Write a protein that binds this ligand. Structure first.
Ligand SMILES: Nc1ncnc2c1ncn2[C@@H]1O[C@H](COP(=O)(O)OP(=O)(O)OP(=O)(O)O)[C@@H](O)[C@H]1O
Ligand SMILES: [Mg+2]
Ligand SMILES: [Zn+2]
Lengths: 300, 189, 222, 595, 174, 196
């Protein structure tokens, strides 16, 4: 669940990749199903929306019992897990997953070639905020990171809703494609980390499920300030928590090889300087030829 | 001018820490420097450092001891006045004598702050208990200082057994108020 | 009288504290400062020699840190002395001008301090004579006048209150009290009062009265 | 039995709670006892962290455990301040979800709740008993009672023969505390569909009294309880904490509620070379153009400086602004923004107002049959700004009832015995339409304005906004509005509403510039030229000018100069401000008069 | 001090005086210029002028009348409740002028009154300076008492507050 | 009267001192009040003219002894008061200039030319002092006692590979060092580095 101990029990379910994948919360039927689940579990809607610290303690203590019988019915059974929780005397206890989420959020939104250099300098600056957040003498930074993480997850949810409602995902035979051109919050996705966050959200919902064949996905976003795309190939993922011989085998990311081959062959003007070779930059007018050649390559 | 206005007529807390860090302390060396290079100091004595033997009590300057502790090459032996029982006794003495200060060292607050910050695993009592005891002692002495401030006058004043940090805290108020009182009195004649 | 480097550092610290808390400008310890500066230079050379050449890591760190500490103490002492000279420039000029006065600047100041005093006095007098004094009549054209409505020469606050610690001799003035403890006796002429200064106690006294004890090292300002 | 253990537990929280190396509550208590503030503010997140069991008790039965946490505080305070003091107040802070005012019902009785609202009325302080000394009528036996103000107490019914109720209170030996009553209305947006806003009665004790004024949004932590006044009880909230965005205490008394760290930020902002541009851009970021009106609004928010001459005459220090123009100009939106940025403001429509609604009204108390005075819009807005929209729809009498309060800043009443002269120091920002809805250039200016010269002369700056159809400007406005519809600078070119409001408060309570001689000579020459210009214009046309230029306009120019100087915390107003003031006056009032 | 700004400001307050001679060509002291100033004239002169005129002149040139800042009402108010009194309104340099007056006339009643006032006020001054705020998430009395302080008391309070604040910052430095 | 201008100048000096005290790190001397000083000196000039006229009248005039004494005393006192106010203002400004000169190792339009010359030659004097027998000490050094031998520092503003006396530091913006405080103390003072 997304930041269980720093938000309401409702928000943790609402803004969770797995829950949204298994319930399709992006449409009204999903919200109805989630409300049905909460009603069945015996948690009043007012109680669930209350923040974690002040929630009624009977339900907080019984959460393990209430979750275990109820979750299997809705297909959300794998939410149950064992993790690491660290407490400093008389302070709130925080888990490893939420700490990592706070650090990542601080990295992402903590705060021609000239603008690119400026953006990279800003990210290098954010590195030190995230590094400071690792010291127990700096807890305000960690709280600031949790707040920013909640904001970022809300924005990613809205963008994914806009993508899925419009059916912007084109299902080709070699891969899936999704290009953003006029979104409301398109300034956010210049950072590779936020773009990968949105990519993971999409990969889990309506791509991991639906009993569809595993197909790699390409996600691209535009920024008017520089008139270029930030393409990002993403590896497919097997259904979560489904141990199997085929699931045991790992899946590699071949987009680096194909991207390099196409860039060398075509006069792409692609930038392949990012450490993650699957992420490049393309000019506004080269994406169509690039994707045509990608489809015709067959090495994806 | 050459000296800032906040360092004129008084010392800063860092200056008091600097002064405190020259007093000797007892350490247990984790290395054997004694021979059966060599330290060469000019501000203190160097014979003790040149003659160290593992797990043998010896005395060195506090700042050298802190430097060694930073390297996990010595374990500071906390003073005898900084045990739980001694602090209970001092608290009782303060409680039973409303008109006097206890006989704590002239560097108890500063040394307590330094050792709690730096050497947390060299005490034989829980750190929280010692922090509580020092807080209680500080409150009692603060009450006594507040009561005693009502006797400022154009003549001398006596504050026996008051520590260095407390005197540094109170130096401006006491000195300026007594100076104004003296000025008024002298103008009278 | 030299004893050991440790004693020299102890006297340096005594002088530093007394100068910081005293209202007047104390005499300069010429011999001690000469010895200390020479030792600083020699120790710097020794550290450089050793460094030019892993068990030896810690001793070098300790020597360098000690050198930093000693340099800081001397720096603060000299800076405070310079500030006091700035405040009492006209007073020291008055001392030198008078011939009946016992004190002379060559004993009360070092060579660097006397150079600073003369140069800064000249500079400031130039500035004020250009800006202001050259327009006033011949009568009000002196930067050191004591016969006007207000005295222009600032003297040290003789009766300033200073915290003192009575540590006794390292004695004719010493005596015992009703309780049998050693003590000193001083008189405050303004109040005609006699105040006992028992050993090992802290007092908030006027500087004038305990000035002689401070000079003889019987008490030390906190 | 259990009470002593509960008291012991809350005493150990105040003596053992450290988050790092500082005892937060032990030190807060000592610092409060030193300034004579016998209370302790505890954050409930810290108590849930020490021992969750202590929070469970304080939340399960609040009116039984809160009285036992006060005595623990008192015992610790005695231990900390007295070397061997009334009962200490406990103020609570919480971050729990706020319950809407109208969602409070039987399910929340005797529970700690958090809610927000608008304070509409405050009562005169009463006196509640905390320690009674009593005696018996017959046998004259002395006793005492101790009372905590948490209800679920009366004098003993039987003595300790003596008839029923034998005890009479001995007042000269008893002790009392302060009590206040507040009415809380729900926020206008929270109200459900087609419903009038609902009220709720609240009571505060001791150090929570005189903390709010009517018309200020607040957040309340308290206990939803009931008191009997058949088998129904009238609900009310027992306040345990008040949080507000308005420093009412600073506004009523001196300068307060600004930390040195907060104060340092304001000085740094004032040192900005182009603070004028930032403030102008910060007003109505979503309205395109109208820069002159935004500068005028900045000056109106800043205000001038008021003077009390030795002979007793007082000079107005506030600026009044009128916006006359065609439809669709965004005058109402500017008024709605100014109501939201100013520390104190009231938005009223000239049509839905009355002479008594503004100023003050005389009301009869149904119980005492005694007439008393209740303040209206201009009293509720005292020390701030009144936004009178639809100024042309107001009736002649209701408009005439505003002249003295606009100029002299006082509301003289002589009705039902009540005879007084209240104080109303407010700035009026009015929006109006011409007679024909659109300013028709064909007809003379005396035909487009029905306002009389007396009311118009009271406005410092008059803006005659005309809508001209220009393709370039039209395209620009279309692009801006579409961007607004489909679509955060905060990079030194704009400051949020909260910071701007705090800066307005700081400047008002910290600066009051004065004119230098050069500015006086400049303004005096300009007044002579403007008056000559009106005369040349009048000689040309038989008709007498509809927009007047009297001494009030000279004083208005002086006020604008002083406000511009105050904007930058400059104790003296120089010519660099006089030029801007003259430019604004020419852009608004001489511009209106020229037509 | 000669270069002490506060002393220069203090020496500039106006004290009542009464001339005792007939000095033509001294009108500028009076409102009107260039007119003789007749004897027994009452006028307010700055201290730096009035004092020297009072000590220099046999009969001096002027006699100092009792200032309204040392009247019987003010002394009674000082004795009743020193802490609650608003000294800033009586005069912003009260203590400096009081010391100067005591020196000029060597009167001991005023000396004792002023000393007691100063001690009692300093008690509350230290009470406020010792009180340091705390931020739980991460007043009125202090402000109302600060508003009443005289200039010298405002300097002493600032110095003591800074000293306490520095010590607290050093002790609890993480 | 005759000291109102001096009083106003001293009030401005008090405001300057209060600003200097309130300011944390950045202090800029207000513009030299040339106009008020010009007015004060003009007033002193008229006072000198008055004294000369009084002396001339006494030499040949009906003036008497008491009247001459009184006027000659009231003019001298006024001149003294003006001089005191002027000197106090100038001394405050010079003290702030001294503090600035020491804060640096050794805008300007605000200063008057005399103050500019004073500051220049005072920095010369400070450097001369630093060159003497106290060379081993950095007289314009840090007045906070040395506490830690090694500190973490961060580069606050980008600059080339500055070659300090202690060594070569590649000051890349947003990069941290683990170094000895003694070496990088000057860079921290200038603002190229921060302790964090
Ligand atoms: N820059 C703008 N200029 C004008 N109108 C705007 C602007 N931006 C938004 N609006 C629209 O203005 C409308 C508000 O009406 P407005 O305040 O302009 O009327 P008014 O001219 O003051 O009143 P009336 O038409 O009764 O005379 C809102 O619909 C708002 O969307
Ligand atoms: Mg409208
Ligand atoms: Zn009875």
């Amino acid at each position: 669940l997304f930041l269980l101990r720093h938000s309401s029990l409702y928000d943790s379910f609402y803004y969770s990749n797995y829950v949204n994948a298994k319930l399709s919360l992006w449409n009204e039927n999903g919200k109805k199903r989630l409300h049905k689940m909460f009603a069945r579990m015996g948690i009043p809607l007012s109680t669930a929306q209350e923040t974690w610290l002040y929630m009624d303690h009977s339900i907080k203590r019984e959460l393990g019992i209430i979750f275990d019988k109820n979750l299997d019915r809705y297909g959300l059974q794998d939410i149950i897990r064992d993790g690491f929780v660290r407490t400093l005397g008389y302070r709130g206890s925080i888990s490893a997953s939420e700490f990592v989420e706070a650090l990542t959020a601080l990295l992402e939104v903590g705060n021609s070639a000239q603008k690119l250099t400026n953006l990279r300098k800003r990210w290098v600056s954010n590195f030190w905020l995230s590094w400071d957040a690792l010291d127990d003498r700096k807890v305000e930074l960690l709280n600031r990171g949790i707040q920013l993480a909640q904001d970022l997850q809300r924005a990613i949810f809205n963008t994914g809703v806009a993508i899925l409602e419009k059916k912007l995902i084109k299902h080709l035979r070699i891969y899936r494609l999704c290009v953003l051109q006029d979104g409301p919050d398109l300034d956010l996705y210049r950072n590779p980390l936020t773009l990968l966050r949105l990519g993971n959200w999409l990969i889990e919902c309506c791509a991991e499920s639906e009993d569809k064949q595993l197909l790699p996905m390409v996600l691209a976003s535009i920024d008017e300030n520089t008139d270029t795309y930030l393409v990002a190939g993403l590896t497919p993922r097997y259904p979560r928590g489904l141990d199997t011989i085929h699931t045991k085998k790992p899946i590699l990311n071949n987009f680096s090889m194909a991207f390099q081959q196409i860039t060398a062959e075509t006069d792409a003007k692609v930038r392949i300087d990012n450490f993650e070779s699957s992420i490049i930059e393309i000019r506004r007018e080269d994406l169509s030829p690039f994707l045509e050649k990608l489809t015709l390559s067959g090495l994806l | 001018m050459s000296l800032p206005a906040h360092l004129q007529q008084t010392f800063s807390p860092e200056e008091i820490q600097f002064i405190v860090e020259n007093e000797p302390i007892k350490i247990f060396p984790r290395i054997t420097t004694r021979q059966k290079t060599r330290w060469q100091l000019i501000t203190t004595d160097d014979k003790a450092l040149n003659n160290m033997v593992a797990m043998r009590s010896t005395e060195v300057v506090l700042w050298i001891a802190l430097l060694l502790k930073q390297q996990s090459k010595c374990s500071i032996v906390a003073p005898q006045w900084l045990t739980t029982k001694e602090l209970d006794r001092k608290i009782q003495y303060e409680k039973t004598h409303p008109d006097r200060f206890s006989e704590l060292p002239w560097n108890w607050l500063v040394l307590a702050r330094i050792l709690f910050n730096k050497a947390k695993d060299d005490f034989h009592d829980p750190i929280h208990e010692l922090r509580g005891k020092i807080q209680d002692l500080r409150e009692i002495r603060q009450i006594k200082v507040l009561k005693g401030l009502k006797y400022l006058n154009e003549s001398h004043l006596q504050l026996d057994n008051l520590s260095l940090l407390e005197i540094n805290e109170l130096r401006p108020f006491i000195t300026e108020i007594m100076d104004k009182l003296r000025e008024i009195h002298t103008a009278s004649l | 009288i030299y004893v050991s480097p440790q004693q020299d550092f102890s006297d340096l610290m005594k002088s530093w504290k007394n100068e910081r808390c005293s209202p007047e400008l104390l005499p300069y310890p010429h011999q001690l400062m000469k010895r200390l500066l020479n030792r600083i230079s020699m120790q710097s050379q020794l550290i450089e020699n050793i460094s030019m050449g892993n068990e030896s890591k810690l001793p070098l760190l300790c020597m360098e840190t000690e050198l930093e500490r000693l340099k800081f103490v001397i720096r603060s002492y000299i800076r405070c002395r310079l500030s006091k000279i700035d405040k009492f420039s006209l007073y020291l000029r008055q001392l030198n001008e008078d011939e009946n006065s016992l004190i002379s600047l060559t004993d009360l100041l070092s060579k660097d301090e006397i150079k600073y005093h003369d140069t800064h006095s000249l500079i400031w007098l130039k500035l004020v004579n250009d800006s202001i004094l050259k327009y006033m009549p011949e009568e009000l054209q002196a930067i050191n006048d004591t016969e006007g409505s207000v005295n222009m020469i600032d003297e040290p606050d003789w009766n300033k209150f200073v915290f003192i610690h009575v540590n006794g001799p390292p004695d004719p003035l010493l005596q015992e009290n009703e309780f049998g403890k050693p003590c000193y006796t001083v008189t405050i002429p303004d109040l005609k009062e006699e105040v006992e200064l028992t050993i090992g106690s802290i007092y908030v006294m006027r500087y004038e009265v305990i000035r002689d004890l401070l000079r003889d090292d019987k008490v030390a300002l906190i | 039995d259990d009470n002593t253990e509960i008291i012991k537990s809350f005493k150990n929280f105040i003596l053992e709670f450290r988050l790092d190396s500082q005892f937060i509550y032990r030190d807060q208590l000592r610092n409060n006892i030193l300034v004579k503030n016998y209370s302790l503010t505890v954050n409930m997140e810290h108590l849930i962290g020490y021992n969750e069991d202590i929070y469970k008790k304080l939340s399960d039965e609040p009116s039984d455990i809160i009285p036992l946490f006060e005595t623990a505080i008192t015992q610790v305070a005695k231990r900390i301040s007295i070397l061997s003091l009334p009962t200490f107040q406990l103020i609570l802070n919480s971050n729990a979800n706020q319950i809407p005012l109208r969602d409070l019902d039987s399910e929340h009785v005797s529970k700690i709740v958090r809610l927000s609202g608008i304070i509409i009325s405050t009562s005169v302080l009463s006196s509640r008993a905390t320690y009674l000394s009593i005696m018996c009528r017959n046998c004259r036996h002395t006793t005492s009672i101790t009372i905590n103000n948490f209800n679920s107490v009366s004098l003993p019914r039987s003595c300790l023969n003596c008839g029923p109720d034998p005890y009479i209170i001995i007042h000269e030996s008893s002790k009392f505390i302060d009590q206040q009553f507040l009415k809380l209305q729900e926020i206008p947006e929270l109200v459900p569909v087609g419903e009038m806003p609902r009220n709720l009665t609240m009571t505060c004790d001791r150090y929570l009294t005189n903390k709010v004024i009517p018309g200020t949004r607040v957040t309340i932590v308290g206990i939803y309880s009931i008191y009997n006044s058949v088998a129904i009880r009238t609900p009310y909230i027992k306040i345990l904490g008040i949080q507000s965005d308005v420093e009412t205490s600073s506004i009523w008394n001196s300068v307060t509620m600004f930390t040195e760290e907060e104060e340092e930020e304001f000085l740094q902002l004032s040192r900005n070379p182009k603070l004028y541009e930032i403030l102008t851009n910060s007003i109505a970021p979503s309205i395109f153009g109208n820069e002159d009106i935004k500068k005028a609004i900045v000056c109106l928010l800043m205000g001038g400086s008021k003077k009390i001459l030795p002979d007793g005459m007082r000079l107005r220090g506030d600026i009044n602004v009128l916006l006359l123009g065609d439809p669709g100009t965004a005058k109402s939106q500017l008024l709605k923004f100014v109501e939201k940025v100013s520390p104190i403001a009231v938005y009223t429509s000239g049509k839905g107002s009355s002479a008594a609604g503004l100023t003050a009204s005389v009301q009869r108390d149904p119980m005492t049959r005694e007439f008393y005075l209740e303040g209206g819009a201009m009293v509720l807005a005292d020390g701030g700004v009144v936004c009178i929209d639809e100024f042309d729809k107001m009736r002649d009498e209701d408009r005439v009832a505003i002249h003295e309060a606009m100029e002299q800043q006082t509301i003289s009443i002589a009705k039902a015995g009540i005879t007084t002269v209240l104080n109303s120091r407010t700035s009026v920002l009015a929006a109006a339409n011409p007679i024909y809805g659109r300013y028709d250039d064909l007809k003379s200016p005396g035909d487009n304005i029905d306002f009389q010269t007396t009311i118009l002369s009271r406005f410092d700056m008059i803006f005659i906004v005309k809508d001209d159809h220009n393709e370039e400007r039209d395209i620009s406005i279309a692009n801006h509005v579409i961007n607004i519809h489909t679509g955060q600078e905060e990079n030194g070119s704009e400051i949020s509403i909260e910071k701007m409001k705090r800066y307005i408060t700081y400047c008002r309570l910290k600066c009051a510039p004065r004119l230098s001689p050069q500015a006086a000579e400049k303004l005096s020459s300009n007044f002579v030229t403007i008056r000559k210009q009106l005369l040349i214009n009048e000689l040309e046309s038989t008709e007498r000018s509809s927009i007047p230029i009297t001494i009030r306009q000279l004083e208005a120019i002086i006020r604008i100069t002083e406000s511009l100087a105050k904007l930058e915390l400059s104790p003296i107003a120089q010519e660099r401000h006089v030029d801007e003031a003259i430019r604004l006056f020419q852009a608004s009032t001489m511009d209106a008069a020229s037509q | 001090g000669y270069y002490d700004i506060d002393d220069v400001l203090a020496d500039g307050t106006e004290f009542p005086c009464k001339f005792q001679y007939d000095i033509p060509g001294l009108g500028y002291l009076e409102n009107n210029p260039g007119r003789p100033i007749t004897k027994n004239t009452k006028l307010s002169l700055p201290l730096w002028l009035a004092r020297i005129l009072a000590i220099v002149g046999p009969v001096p040139f002027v006699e100092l009348l009792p200032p309204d800042m040392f009247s019987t009402k003010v002394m009674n108010a000082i004795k009743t409740d020193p802490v609650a009194l608003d000294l800033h309104s009586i005069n912003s340099h009260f203590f400096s002028l009081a010391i100067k007056w005591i020196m000029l006339f060597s009167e001991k009643e005023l000396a004792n009154v002023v000393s007691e006032l100063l001690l009692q006020r300093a008690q509350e001054l230290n009470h406020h300076a010792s009180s340091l705020s705390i931020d739980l998430n991460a007043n009125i009395a202090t402000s109302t008492f600060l508003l009443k302080l005289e200039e010298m008391e405002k300097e002493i309070y600032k110095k003591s507050h800074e000293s306490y604040k520095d010590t607290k910052r050093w002790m609890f430095k993480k | 009267m005759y000291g109102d201008l001096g009083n106003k100048l001293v009030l401005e000096a008090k405001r300057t001192k209060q600003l200097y005290a309130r300011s944390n790190q950045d202090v800029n001397l207000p513009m030299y009040h040339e106009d008020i000083i010009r007015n004060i000196l003009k007033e002193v000039s008229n006072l000198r003219k008055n004294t000369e006229y009084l002396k001339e009248q006494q030499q040949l005039g009906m003036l008497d002894d008491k009247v001459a004494k009184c006027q000659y005393f009231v003019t001298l006192l006024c001149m003294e008061r003006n001089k005191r106010c002027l000197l106090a203002y100038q001394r405050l400004r010079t003290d702030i200039l001294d503090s600035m000169a020491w804060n640096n190792n050794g805008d300007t339009n605000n200063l008057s030319h005399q103050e500019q010359e004073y500051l220049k030659e005072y920095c010369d004097l400070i450097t001369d002092l630093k060159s003497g027998d106290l060379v081993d000490i950095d007289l314009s050094g840090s007045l906070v006692p040395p506490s830690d031998v090694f500190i973490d520092v961060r580069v606050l503003k980008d600059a080339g590979e500055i070659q300090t006396e202690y060594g070569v530091f590649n000051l890349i913006k947003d990069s941290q060092f683990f170094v000895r405080q003694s070496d990088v103390e000057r860079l921290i003072q200038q603002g190229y580095l921060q302790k964090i």
